[PDB]
Design a protein around this ligand. Structure first.
Ligand code: F43
Ligand SMILES: C[C@@H](OP(=O)(O)O)[C@H](NC(=O)/C=C/CCCCSSCCS(=O)(=O)O)C(=O)O
Lengths: 296, 259, 194, 47, 495, 220
């Protein structure tokens, strides 16, 4: 119903456009003003897409179709050191961001090495809390092959590495190894696009799975209702105060202090505790909301 | 005698340019800024104190006899020996009421003893301080030549004539001399034209509505008034170019038959 | 050796072949220990001297956040005869995001008169000890000459609530910082943090 | 080091006369003629 | 609520990378500075260190005065000798010192000839083959222009022009040519015929890239102020690898901007920051490419590539149409306007497109500059602004000087240059003038613009800078992957 | 968005109409009788079963000027109305130049309340002899560009609003005499735009104190 896109335009007369979006029933998921241009991730009903395109072309704006602007991705790097973090890992994260997703760098405590690499249970659960996980591996076939125990999560997976083709029982994208320069060559860009296509395919499949038994309320409108009701969400200092997942939300407020308030939020005629699973998150003691399906 | 036209064209932009060039056309005033407030924004002298001089009054100094030099009546600032100061404006490309070359032409057509300089994102006029303040208040600031949103009295850092406007329709300023007071809807100058803060902000009125800006602007734009919609200006420009070319090739009456 | 999770920014970078960070953005490192403040996302600040300090701290075992200032270039409006070229400033949300960290590391440039006043305006709203990483040799007293709280040279009338806890010189903008500078910064952070 | 002496800052060489000693937070501080506190360990006597 | 300590964010666009026209590389604006870009420095070095010497008078002296017989074998031996002597090796005078070969690895002495029979039995190591490097029609045109003459191209080391100035190159080549001549043909080391060789190679048969500027300008030869626009058009080698006239003119525009506006004007006649954003405006984004392609489409739709003879009416029509289109594009797309924030950038781009269009319509370069000046004075009335004050000096006197015949004001645009009196000071004009001069000949499908020898000489595959695709090389230099000569690391201590 | 109600039946005319007019019936009739006579208000309010009382002029032909409460929802929830009438000669008759000064006339209608009701109220702000200035609304005086400025001497009984040129923008005023220099609000002609004139009832502007409200009726 609500297809999510990105509007890129100027700040002049942007308030009138926001008023129009409110009038037609859309939601402004994201807003950022750089100097004189504003980027807005907006979720509006499908029957108003052409109307919004006409409105955007009136303000000399630009509509960018974001195929991943409803999910949060766990980019898993073996460590946050100079080998992986300041290059490749950021390129993967920023390319994911370029298509609307909300990434989270996951630097494993013991992810480096060949036979000394291990993944903890807490890291496993933290990765599982996301929608899809992207692994940024090295550039040796033997090292990657002797490292399959790292990619043991019941989440859609895309593994990236140096060698062009791997023989692991997962999706693999080659020519994205451990590097030290910014990814700007044509081959590297093509490999990034291939990784984007793989994650897009997995996300669309999962979207069909969810569409078989739709949730009682969409995550985006649930986030809007929480923002309207809860008055502490504008005091959050995190990058994304409320993250829109595929079938839920992540509220970046303390669980011990605000879970009772979150649960006792009335949407429609239901109480939130009766339609969603509110639980504490392994992510800095935040609140994780998982929506129930109409079957229950 | 010779009754002067001032500019070719039939569009509203050409008419506004003619109005600015016309010295007998009374510019419509849209605000009232006191003389002391203009002097404060200008930032050269403290209001209430006397003008500094660069030379003794013209009566005190001795000059040789010069019949042709004595035919011209000097300015009062020249008579008293006041120093020469400047006032500078930046005009937005988005329908600002006055534009650099238009400003310079109107200044040299309407004011006496002025020094006008034109840049792409800047326009400055220099004159003796007393007369400069007089015509800055009377013509430059109180009339339609000035819009507190799309134009700004600013020296030092000028930038934003080609950038887009901000959320209030104001031209970009890297020093933020003028801010928009949303409570009253007025533009207030919190700094003088070079950037040093003012003790008391001065109210310069409220931004001109955009429809009026479309009606009074002197710039040609694809969205408001295109030069293609004014073929008469293009023809005159091409005529000037061809006359220049023919005169630079061979300046005779025969080569100008191909004009 | 413990897991380190970063809250990546919610907005993308500067175009295709440009930088990965964006101006006026914050990336929380969950457990708030150190925040690295970059004046801009440009090549003069980002990934050449700043992400290097970031990965040095993250290698030392200390979680790090990186904050790119919305307006980090220029001199503050309170500088003598005002500012020129551009105006430096700190937003209240930026100050709140900084103030939840144990320590701050901030990267400054070449001109001394710019650095002193920028640090004064920065510490007017930041109340945690900070480390100044600049190129020029600046003495840990010229900040006190204009009123800044300083560990070695206190002012009689302090105009800031933040303490300049260390000054490290020899880090050039846009150039890879050698391992010696990273080691010095890490040692200062470790000895002035816990 | 005492009031009226002549001291110079080792790091820069600024010359001034000691105005007062104002201990704070169980720590000695030296005030010079420029109304700036200093540390005794970073100052030394000159004649 | 007004907080004066919030500050004003500034320069968002300048933080974003600059694409390069007709390429797919993104680079920072700091990497396009001529001091920070080794590719631009190597471009200027390769142009500076090139001298073409006609080795026909010397052969005639050897045949008619010294009674020595010149055959292709003797020429091969001479080439072997000079390739050793020109970098600084010793041929006579026992007990000499020699320059380190590592510092002169870019030093070549090449030979090309319009005589196919002589070119057949010549060592292909030292031969610039016109047949192999140029398409059939272009090769025939170049051979017809050059004739049955033999020329030698000397590329003295870049280190020589970096330690010294540009006036060193001709003298260096002349001394080494004389030495190689006297040692390859077993002549007396010093006689009257030696003076004949020296005079021939010093001025009679020498071709300089740039003339000297004595007097007020005060500069030696082979400086960027002495390079005419046609010479720079012939330096660029896109004409022999591509058939798109707009692409050729735009590569010449990029090279001209990077040479004149950046190096010559922002360093030789100015200093400090220089003019990087004035020059990159013509070759970073496709703005100039889009405007030029529109101009070509309009001309081909109503006139044709050479369908009309240069008259005033066609100049007015094409220049006005292209200027109106370019300014409308600036109005419609705020991204374009914020990219070319300065008025000078915009004026230069629109006027360059208009001049290129007029040249593609008429095939005359002076009509091209006339169109450029009409575009400037039409831009002025359209936007009520042109550029920085001091920009439109030459643009005001331009219309009168474009078709002038007076001594100080007349010159074909190929024969004009930075020493033309109107063009001698201001940025944002010269590279586009060179592009207009090239477009005058790209319309006709010409093999060269002003000098066939320069075209053949810079078609050499052993040049450090690839002049076929200047923008690609500039992008490579901006990305720190261009290898430049003139470096002296074998004679320096380890750091 | 403030929801004011719902459309019960016949939604399809709203669903399918893309432009033009749609006939709408409001179930609660608007109980705002300000341009009517006292007997009309009596019969309409008694036909709705609302207790009624009179405040001002009692005559059956007396024009209602104010009703308490003035909102239909309040009237229905309280089931009582206090209707105030005015003397026939106390009602000021004005004519508004809508074609001559569109923005100024729109501002005058908004500030005096003629956009919603049939009788507007003007409050006296400052008074001296011939000049009586009315209060302004510093919420509708935004686009007050000079619209209808005088060219000759202003005649008596002319309503004017000072435009954005002057410091006291938006203040309305009228004077009972004529002068060739100053407008009805004490500003020069370039700072006043004429919006309308008083047509029928006069000699009440000279007997109204500061702060008192006079009521106007548009006669076109
Ligand atoms: C900042 C100044 C001060 C001055 O004396 N010249 C400046 C700055 C100077 C310095 C910048 C370095 C520095 O430290 O100042 C240099 C490099 C001078 C030079 N050697 O060529 C320069 N400008 Ni300027 N300058 C430029 C430009 C411009 C445009 C900017 C337009 C806008 O509204 O933003 C305008 C000229 C105009 O009004 O047409 C301009 C103005 C100005 N320019 C005025 C404006 C403020 C003043 O009133 O004092 N530059 C440009 O248009 C782009 C090219 C750019 C040149 C450097 C480059 O090519 O990379 C630079 C060229
Ligand atoms: C050598 C010098 O000659 P001249 O200064 O004696 O004319 C000559 N320079 C000039 O003509 C002028 C130099 C100024 C640089 C161009 C200005 S670009 S930015 C300034 C905009 S403005 O505010 O000055 O109008 C040159 O060839 O560079």
């Amino acid at each position: 119903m609500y297809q999510i896109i990105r509007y890129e335009g100027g700040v002049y007369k942007n308030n009138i456009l926001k008023e129009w979006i409110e009038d037609v029933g859309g939601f402004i998921i994201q807003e950022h003003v750089m100097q004189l241009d504003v980027y807005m991730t907006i979720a509006i009903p499908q029957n108003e897409i052409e109307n919004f395109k006409e409105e955007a072309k009136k303000y000399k704006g630009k509509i960018v179709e974001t195929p991943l602007a409803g999910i949060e991705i766990a980019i898993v790097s073996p460590s946050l050191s100079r080998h992986h973090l300041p290059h490749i890992a950021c390129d993967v994260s920023e390319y994911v961001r370029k298509f609307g997703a909300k990434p989270n760098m996951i630097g494993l405590a013991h992810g480096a090495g060949k036979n000394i690499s291990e993944i903890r249970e807490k890291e496993k659960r933290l990765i599982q809390e996301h929608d899809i996980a992207i692994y940024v591996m090295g550039n040796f076939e033997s090292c990657i092959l002797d490292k399959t125990h790292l990619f043991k999560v019941d989440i859609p997976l895309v593994v990236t590495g140096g060698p062009e083709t791997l023989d692991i029982p997962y999706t693999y994208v080659g020519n994205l190894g451990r590097r030290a320069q910014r990814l700007r060559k044509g081959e590297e860009i093509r490999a990034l696009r291939q990784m984007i296509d793989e994650v897009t395919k997995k996300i669309n499949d999962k979207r069909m799975e969810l569409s078989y038994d739709p949730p009682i309320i969409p995550p985006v409108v649930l986030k809007d209702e929480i923002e309207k009701r809860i008055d502490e969400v504008r005091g959050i200092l995190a990058p994304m105060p409320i993250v829109t997942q595929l079938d839920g939300l992540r509220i970046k407020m303390d669980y011990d202090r605000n879970h009772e308030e979150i649960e006792n939020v009335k949407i429609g005629k239901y109480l939130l505790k009766d339609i969603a699973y509110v639980t504490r998150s392994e992510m800095k003691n935040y609140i994780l909301i998982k929506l129930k399906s109409t079957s229950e | 005698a010779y009754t002067p036209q001032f500019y070719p064209g039939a569009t509203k932009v050409a008419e506004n340019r003619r109005n600015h060039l016309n010295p007998n056309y009374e510019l419509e005033k849209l605000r009232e800024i006191p003389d002391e407030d203009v002097v404060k924004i200008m930032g050269h002298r403290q209001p209430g104190e006397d003008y500094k001089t660069v030379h003794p009054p013209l009566e005190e100094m001795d000059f040789v006899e010069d019949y042709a030099r004595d035919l011209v009546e000097p300015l009062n600032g020249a008579k008293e020996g006041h120093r020469v100061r400047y006032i500078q404006f930046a005009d937005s490309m988005y329908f600002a009421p006055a534009q650099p070359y238009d400003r310079s032409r109107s200044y040299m057509s309407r004011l006496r003893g002025v020094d006008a300089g034109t840049l792409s994102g800047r326009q400055v006029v220099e004159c003796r301080e007393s007369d400069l303040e007089e015509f800055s208040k009377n013509i430059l600031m109180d009339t339609e030549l000035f819009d507190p949103a799309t134009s700004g009295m600013r020296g030092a850092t000028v930038h934003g004539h080609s950038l887009r406007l901000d959320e209030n329709g104001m031209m970009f300023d890297a020093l933020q001399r003028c801010v928009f007071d949303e409570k009253t809807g007025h533009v207030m100058y919190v700094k003088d034209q070079v950037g040093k803060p003012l003790d008391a902000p001065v109210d310069v009125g409220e931004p001109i509505p955009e429809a009026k800006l479309r009606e009074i602007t002197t710039i040609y734009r694809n969205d408001g008034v295109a030069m293609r919609a004014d073929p008469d200006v293009i023809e005159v420009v091409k005529r000037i170019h061809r006359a220049r070319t023919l005169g630079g090739y061979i300046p005779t009456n025969e080569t100008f038959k191909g004009l | 050796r413990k897991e380190q999770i970063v809250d990546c920014r919610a907005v993308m970078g500067l175009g295709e072949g440009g930088g990965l960070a964006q101006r006026g953005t914050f990336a929380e490192g969950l457990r708030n220990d150190v925040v690295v403040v970059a004046m801009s996302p440009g090549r003069r600040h980002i990934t050449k001297p700043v992400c290097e300090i970031t990965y040095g701290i993250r290698e030392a075992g200390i979680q790090t956040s990186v904050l790119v200032l919305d307006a980090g270039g220029g001199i503050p409006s309170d500088a003598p005869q005002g500012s020129l070229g551009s105006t430096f400033g700190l937003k209240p949300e930026e100050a709140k995001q900084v103030n939840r960290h144990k320590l701050c590391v901030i990267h400054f440039g070449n001109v001394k008169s710019h650095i002193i006043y920028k640090a004064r305006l920065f510490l007017k709203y930041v109340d945690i000890p900070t480390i100044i990483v600049c190129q020029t040799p600046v003495d840990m007293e010229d900040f006190a000459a204009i009123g800044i709280k300083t560990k070695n040279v206190m002012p009689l009338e302090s105009k800031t609530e933040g303490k300049i806890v260390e000054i490290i010189t020899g880090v050039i903008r846009g150039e890879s910082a050698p391992q010696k500078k990273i080691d010095e910064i890490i040692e200062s952070i470790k000895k002035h943090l816990g | 080091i005492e009031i009226g002496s002549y001291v110079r800052y080792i790091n820069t060489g600024t010359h001034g006369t000691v105005k007062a000693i104002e201990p704070k937070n169980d720590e000695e501080w030296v005030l010079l003629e420029n109304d700036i506190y200093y540390r005794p360990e970073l100052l030394e006597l000159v004649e | 609520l007004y907080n004066p300590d919030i500050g004003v964010p500034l320069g968002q666009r300048k933080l974003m990378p600059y694409k390069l026209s007709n390429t797919d590389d993104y680079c920072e604006g700091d990497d396009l500075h001529f001091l920070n870009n080794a590719a631009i420095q190597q471009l200027w070095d390769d142009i500076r260190r090139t001298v073409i010497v006609g080795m026909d008078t010397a052969h005639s002296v050897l045949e008619k005065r010294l009674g020595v017989e010149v055959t292709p074998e003797t020429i091969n031996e001479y080439m072997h000798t000079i390739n050793h002597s020109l970098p600084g090796g010793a041929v006579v005078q026992e007990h000499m010192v020699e320059v380190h070969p590592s510092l002169a690895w870019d030093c070549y002495a090449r030979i090309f000839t319009g005589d196919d029979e002589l070119a057949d039995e010549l060592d292909s190591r030292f031969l610039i083959d016109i047949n192999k490097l140029f398409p059939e029609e272009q090769a025939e045109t170049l051979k017809a222009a050059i004739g049955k003459k033999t020329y030698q191209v000397s590329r003295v080391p870049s280190l020589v022009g970096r330690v010294c100035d540009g006036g060193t190159i001709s003298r260096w080549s002349a001394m080494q040519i004389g030495m190689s001549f006297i040692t390859a043909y077993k002549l007396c080391a010093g006689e009257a015929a030696t003076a004949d060789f020296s005079y021939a190679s010093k001025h009679a048969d020498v071709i300089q890239m740039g003339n000297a500027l004595p007097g007020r300008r005060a500069r030696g030869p082979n400086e960027p102020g002495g390079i005419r626009f046609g010479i720079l058009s012939d330096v660029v080698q896109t004409t022999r690898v591509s058939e798109d006239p707009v692409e050729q003119s735009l590569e010449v525009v990029a090279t001209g901007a990077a040479l004149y506006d950046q190096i010559w004007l922002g360093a030789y006649m100015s200093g400090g920051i220089g003019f990087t954003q004035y020059a990159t405006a013509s070759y970073t984004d496709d703005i100039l490419d889009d405007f030029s392609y529109y101009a070509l489409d309009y001309v081909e739709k109503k006139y044709g590539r050479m369908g009309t003879k240069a008259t005033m009416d066609v100049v007015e029509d094409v220049a006005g149409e292209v200027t109106l289109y370019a300014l409308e594009q600036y109005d419609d797309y705020p991204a374009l306007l914020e990219d070319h924030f300065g008025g000078s950038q915009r004026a230069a781009v629109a006027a360059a497109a208009s001049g290129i269009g007029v040249c593609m319509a008429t095939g005359n370069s002076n009509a091209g500059v006339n169109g450029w000046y009409l575009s400037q004075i039409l831009h002025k009335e359209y936007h009520s602004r042109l550029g920085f004050y001091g920009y439109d000096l030459q643009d005001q006197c331009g219309a009168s000087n474009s078709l002038a015949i007076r001594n100080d004001e007349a010159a074909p645009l190929e024969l004009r240059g930075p020493n033309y009196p109107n063009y001698a000071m201001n940025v944002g004009h010269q590279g586009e003038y060179a592009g207009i001069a090239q477009a005058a000949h790209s319309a006709r499908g010409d093999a060269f613009a002003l000098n066939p020898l320069v075209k053949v000489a810079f078609a050499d595959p052993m040049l450090v800078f690839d002049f076929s695709k200047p923008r690609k090389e500039i992008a490579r230099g901006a990305l720190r992957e261009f290898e430049a000569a003139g470096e002296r690391d074998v004679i320096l201590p380890a750091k | 968005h403030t929801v004011v109600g719902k459309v019960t039946d016949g939604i399809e005319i709203v669903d399918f109409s893309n432009s033009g007019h749609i006939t709408v019936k409001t179930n609660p009739e608007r109980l705002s009788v300000i341009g009517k006579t006292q007997k009309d208000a009596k019969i309409l309010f008694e036909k709705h079963g609302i207790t009624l009382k009179m405040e001002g002029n009692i005559d059956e032909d007396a024009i209602i000027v104010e009703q308490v409460p003035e909102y239909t929802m309040d009237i229905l929830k309280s089931k009582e109305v206090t209707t105030k009438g005015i003397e026939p000669e106390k009602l000021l008759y004005v004519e508004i130049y809508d074609k001559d000064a569109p923005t100024t006339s729109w501002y005058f209608r908004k500030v005096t309340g003629l956009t919603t009701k049939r009788i507007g109220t003007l409050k006296i702000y400052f008074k001296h002899d011939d000049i009586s200035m009315f209060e302004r609304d510093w919420d509708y005086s935004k686009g007050l560009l000079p619209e209808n400025t005088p060219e000759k001497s202003i005649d008596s009984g002319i309503i004017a609003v000072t435009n954005m040129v002057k410091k006291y923008k938006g203040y309305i005023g009228v004077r009972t005499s004529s002068n060739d220099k100053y407008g009805p609000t004490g500003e020069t002609f370039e700072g006043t735009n004429i919006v309308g004139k008083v047509v029928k009832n006069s000699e009440i502007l000279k007997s109204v104190k500061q702060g008192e409200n006079i009521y106007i009726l548009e006669v076109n």
